[PDB]
DNA sequence: AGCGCCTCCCCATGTGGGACCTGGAGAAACAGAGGGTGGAGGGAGCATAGAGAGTCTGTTCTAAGCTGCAAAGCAAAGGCCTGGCGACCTAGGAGACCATGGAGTTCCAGAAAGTGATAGTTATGCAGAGCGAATGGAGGGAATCAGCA
DNA sequence: TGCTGATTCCCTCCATTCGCTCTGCATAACTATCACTTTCTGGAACTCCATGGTCTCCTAGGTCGCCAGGCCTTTGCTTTGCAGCTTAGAACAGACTCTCTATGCTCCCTCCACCCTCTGTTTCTCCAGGTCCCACATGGGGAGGCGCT
């Protein structure tokens, strides 16, 4: 149960850093592909940012976005 | 031994005899059981002792001595039963019951 | 041969005053005219095909009858 | 399964109007009449009128015309009786009765009846009051005034209770009701046989003619049984 | 010409029997006759589709009951059963 | 002069309309309506005069009878003059 | 020991394989198709018997089914229906 | 002595000797010409190709290689002569046809 | 001995069944109304399903006399026989 | 949160049941009402399955057939909510009152 | 009896849309389909679509979607055709014509056919052209590209005429049509025998298979007499 | 602005005058009744098994209850437009009458066509096996609705 | 006018079960064949009745004009049904038992069809009055515009 909690947590800091980023979740959708050639939708990022999808999709989905984070913090 | 008829047997005025005629040659069945006409026979005479008494109370109410089949109508349409075994059933020169929707009057 | 104008707007309206309507449209007579057309040719289909089956040239009432009663409209009076 | 439910007794006050309720279940409302029978000790019962919901049809006895007055509605199935203008001779018992619209019919399932305080063709029945033995033969008779095509019931009745319908046409039996019970005769002269006794039949035995417009009861039978 | 039959007689004396001072006129006559061809039809129809699903080669009286009872309306269908029950019963109580 | 509102002539059409039985169409129009309608399916053939005449009787109490579920329509579509959709609306519901 | 139930889901099913050879049914369609045919042939069999009736007949012969075809079957419908009828009778009465 | 049944002499499917039977046995009529029971199998392989072939046209058009009662109803309601045929006529696990009224829809 | 099941015909049961006749609202009132109606024609169909059984001298109530019934009341049901 | 307008659901719903084909009504409580109704005509009676299976397609098919009539009516009317009148004057003119 | 109602000629500059109306008389308006056919001396007749006024349902040619539209109004027993940016290949004869919605019926009756001038089954039909004497016989051939299971149509077409039924289901004959005309064959191969000619035989003949969804025409084969 | 006494038109009742339709009597004739035969269809017992109650259980999916609110329903005013009512002049319907010729019907012959009985062979129903079509699960994307700008 | 965010519904894939389709066996019913009968074409006269045309007289309909009242639109209030959420309860599916009743088999036996005579019931035809519809008079009742309050 600690990993959904630190799951959300984690989604609510990247929401926070796109809204401070100004980049939108087809933004990050689209540079899912360019970081690692597996491009995703606008509901995926939804999906992920609601915090509703699958725990095995949870996790498939977010290490793509640890990367992410670390790619939007400086590039 | 006189040739007393079937009707007067049941005590009928339907005729039993001409009923299972009816019954033998209209391609019901391939017998017909000889207790199913002095049946029918009654049935029927009791319908239309029902209807012919209330459509001569009618012709009474309305003072007529005769039976006209605006009687028949109002005795058919007034009753129940008799409106809903004769629902899909037009009878000629009888009209159609005296009503007017209460919206309708002034006031 | 036209002869539905002969269905005049009077002849409705005591249709209707007999049903119990009180005000009436002055486009109800078409459409009236329209449905007693419709109503008309299905009876009078059904009765000449009785007539036709029959080898007659002339319709009786009985086949009116007939066809009246296959549509569900059991009439009474005419045999 | 039929029932007809009635309301309490009224103690009322002359001169004003008093309304009767005759909610009924366990049938087809539309399709059955309701007759109301006033009842007093002195005049018998008394056939007042029927209503018809199917087309809230009525038709009143002549002695009441006007004085009664009977209202249908049809969403709460409810029959309702009015009475204005209160004259002292209205302390009675009232009960309203299923009827169909068929003639051979009569008023099979009656009310409770309400007892309300004030603050044509004439049956006689022969018998005023006779005694029987526990296994005699009774045999009343219901002489008509007129001719009726058959159309007479014979009622039973205990103190204190609705009357009970026991034959109808003058020789069908009732539902419900055993076979030593035997109704006879047509025309003018009509009987009724009891065959074997019970110490159920100590009651009050009326007949009621519906061959004509105003409805007769007779004066009535008390029989008591030991 | 050619002897047509109908329940003319019949009705005029069931009439007589209930009503012996009102009389009736043609047009009620024809009413009357297309009223007992018809409910005559419909028994009958409904009695050879009732042999007819129990595998019965005859039609009885219990088969023209079981009609009337699924035709006619309640007190309707019940007064009829009793009049054809004591018809049938008065037949066979006399030869 | 003397000139009744509008509705009370319309009642007393109604009263008299539903008191009597005879019927409302004249019977020349109705039998020249009825052999050209026949036509199309006949080129050259008769009529009993009671072939006419029932068809007269059964036209008239079908028109009489939608023209009663009609005045329901009309009087369920809070009105008291009947227009073409509550005819429409009527046969729509009886099937035709 | 058991005895056995007749329909036409045999023949139905030989009718859809010259309409539809790659095409399937379900035996809940069957069921329907069954009573589709046990329905329209109670009705034009039943017609043919009141149509042989009126006019004082002891036989039904293709005259009365194709009457009864044209009464109650819609126009094409009944069209196409007698021109089917007409074509097998042809066809039969020439072997 | 041989075969030919009557179906394969009229080129049909459905079974004269059967519908003959059936004929006779039905209780309409005291004889039957032999040319009723061919009309009449002729008329219902007809009825039956037409209702199957725009069932499998709608199973079709549905992706599916199988005909449910579902495609029997959109191929019975969708037409003006085959719905009057069998317009008072309930299928069972038919559903309706989808529609919805205009005024119903939201602008 | 069952009483009172007319209750178990529910509320979403009779929307579900207006929403497959094409009914964007309901009231509150059409409910008993439709639960009255389902009753009376039940007791229709059913009391000539009966009779039906009874004229065969049965005590069970087969789908056959439930296809008579509804082929007698003009109701005409396809897909269970006959 | 979020929230959809009244008459959306509704008309999905409507999208919904209409593409479906099986019944509405749960099996048990109608065959209790079924079994319910039947005891006042003949004591200890016993149906096949087949049998309330059929009278449930005939009781939905007849419901669903009214609210189309019911629908009419109300759209009659000038209204989207169907009315107990509205289902009376259906009823009233198919013939079933 | 049966009349298809049509315009005039409608001269259109490219760009706008144009409306083609056709109504109808003699009929059951609501039981049968309504067919949009247009008519080119490039590539002959060719099928646009259909819609079927008892759902108002539509069908339309893959290659003529989003081109044309077809709308149905029942009051005036009238459908309309909407053509929308008329390019430089759209002057042609549009045509409409009465089908029912049973399977093996064909487009019967045509309308008269609107002139618009802007300022799937291969049908192999083996003679383009062929001269023929007073009283001979003339074979047509209509090899079809895929299985038609007998729905296939022979039209004859006046020049500046609508086309003519004269073969429906490969082998019946259309109504008025005399027994000259003889169809024939079944699968892919079928024929039209024309017995003994008249003068009133010099026309374009034409099949129509209607057993796929696309509804393909003939190339056409003129028959010219003496 | 509010009822009410005159005016007026319409309906309901009474009293003759006949004209039409119903009721009643006589003669064919045909069909219902009587009686004797013979072959069934349909009853009574008797048994077996399919089947329909009846009960337990675990689940999870659906129903029930509450809440916020928005949009649909209902009432009230106002306007205009469209039917109702009355007058009048005329065309067409209603009723009666005659001619007629084409049609519906009864009469008799007989010839094609349907029935009835038998053998048996072929078509069809019932039971069993094996793939295929069809559900469910899981994502994934396109479409659409709703609130912020 | 967006548009970005959030739900929701349609597209694929992949095992996975369930059911449809094919095959084999028995048995019942369909057909070929012959003898018999009997229904109905097919002329044919023969009456009859539906059409067509004439004629006259009313009277119902078509047209027009005027007005009121009813239907439609707009606006505002309110109220109630919907969308959504949380909790629990009962429907469902399977798995037994347990009787019970529906179905088939056999015996036989009552009764219904069939045939031949016969007579008496019914239907067709024709008179005779009684029921009733029309014409006219009288009176009550209901509707509706104007006076005094």
């Not at chain 1, 990022?45 to 400086?74: G, H, T, Y």
């Amino acid at each position: 149960k600690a990993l959904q909690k630190e799951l959300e947590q984690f989604a609510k800091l990247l929401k926070q850093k796109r809204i401070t980023l100004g980049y939108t979740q087809a933004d990050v959708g689209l540079t899912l592909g360019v970081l690692f050639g597996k491009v995703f939708s606008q509901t995926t990022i939804c999906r992920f940012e609601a915090l509703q999808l699958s725990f095995k999709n949870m996790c498939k989905l977010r290490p793509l976005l640890q990367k992410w984070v670390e790619e939007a913090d400086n590039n | 031994a006189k040739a007393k008829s079937r009707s007067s047997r049941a005590g009928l005025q339907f005729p039993v005899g001409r009923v299972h005629r009816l019954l033998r040659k209209g391609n019901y069945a391939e017998r017909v059981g000889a207790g199913a006409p002095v049946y029918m026979a009654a049935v029927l005479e009791y319908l239309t002792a029902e209807i012919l008494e209330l459509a001569g109370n009618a012709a009474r109410d309305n003072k007529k001595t005769r039976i006209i089949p605006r009687h028949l109508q109002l005795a058919i349409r007034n009753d129940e039963e008799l409106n809903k075994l004769l629902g899909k059933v037009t009878i000629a020169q009888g009209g159609v019951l005296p009503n007017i929707q209460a919206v309708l009057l002034p006031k | 041969r036209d002869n539905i104008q002969g269905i005049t707007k009077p002849a409705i309206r005591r249709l209707a005053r007999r049903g119990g309507v009180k005000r009436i449209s002055g486009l109800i007579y078409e459409e009236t005219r329209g449905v007693l057309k419709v109503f008309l040719e299905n009876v009078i289909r059904d009765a000449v095909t009785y007539t036709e089956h029959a080898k007659r040239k002339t319709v009786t009432a009985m086949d009116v009858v007939y066809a009246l009663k296959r549509q569900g409209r059991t009439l009474y009076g005419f045999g | 399964e039929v029932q007809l439910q009635q309301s309490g007794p009224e103690l009322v006050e002359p001169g004003t109007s008093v309304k009767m309720p005759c909610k009924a279940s366990g049938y087809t409302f539309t399709s059955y009449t309701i007759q109301w029978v006033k009842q007093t000790p002195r005049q018998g019962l008394e056939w007042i009128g029927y209503i018809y919901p199917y087309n809230a049809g009525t038709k009143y006895n002549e002695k009441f015309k006007g004085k009664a007055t009977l209202t249908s509605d049809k969403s709460s199935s409810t029959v309702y009786m009015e009475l204005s203008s209160l004259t002292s001779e209205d302390s009675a018992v009232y009960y309203c009765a299923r009827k169909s619209s068929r003639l051979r019919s009569t008023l099979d399932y009656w009310g409770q009846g309400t007892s309300v305080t004030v603050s044509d063709i004439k049956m006689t029945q022969s018998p005023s009051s006779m005694h029987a033995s526990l296994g005699e033969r009774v045999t009343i008779t219901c002489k008509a005034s007129q001719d009726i095509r058959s159309y007479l019931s014979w009622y039973q009745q205990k103190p204190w209770k609705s009357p009970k319908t026991l034959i109808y046409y003058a020789t069908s039996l009732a539902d419900g009701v055993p076979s030593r019970f035997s109704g006879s005769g047509s025309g003018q002269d009509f009987s009724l046989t009891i065959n074997n006794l019970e110490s159920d039949d100590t009651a009050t035995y009326y007949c009621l003619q519906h061959g004509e417009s105003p409805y007769t009861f007779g004066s009535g039978t008390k029989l008591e049984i030991k | 010409r050619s002897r047509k039959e109908s329940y003319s007689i019949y009705v005029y004396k069931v009439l007589k029997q209930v009503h012996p001072d009102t009389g009736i006129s043609s047009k009620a006559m024809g009413i009357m006759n297309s009223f007992v061809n018809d409910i005559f039809e419909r028994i009958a129809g409904e009695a050879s589709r009732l042999a007819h699903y129990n595998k019965r080669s005859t039609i009885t009286s219990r088969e023209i009951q079981t009609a009337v009872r699924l035709l006619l309306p309640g007190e309707l269908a019940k007064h009829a059963v009793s009049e054809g029950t004591k018809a049938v019963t008065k037949y066979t109580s006399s030869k | 002069p003397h000139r009744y509102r509008p509705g009370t002539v319309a009642l007393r059409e109604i009263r008299r309309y539903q008191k009597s039985t005879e019927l409302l169409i004249r019977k020349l129009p109705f039998q020249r309506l009825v052999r050209e309608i026949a036509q199309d399916f006949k080129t050259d053939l008769r009529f009993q005069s009671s072939a006419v005449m029932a068809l007269q009787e059964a036209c008239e109490a079908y028109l009489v009878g939608l023209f009663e579920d009609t005045n329901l329509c009309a009087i369920h579509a809070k009105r008291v003059t009947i227009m073409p959709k509550d005819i429409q609306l009527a046969r729509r519901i009886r099937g035709e």
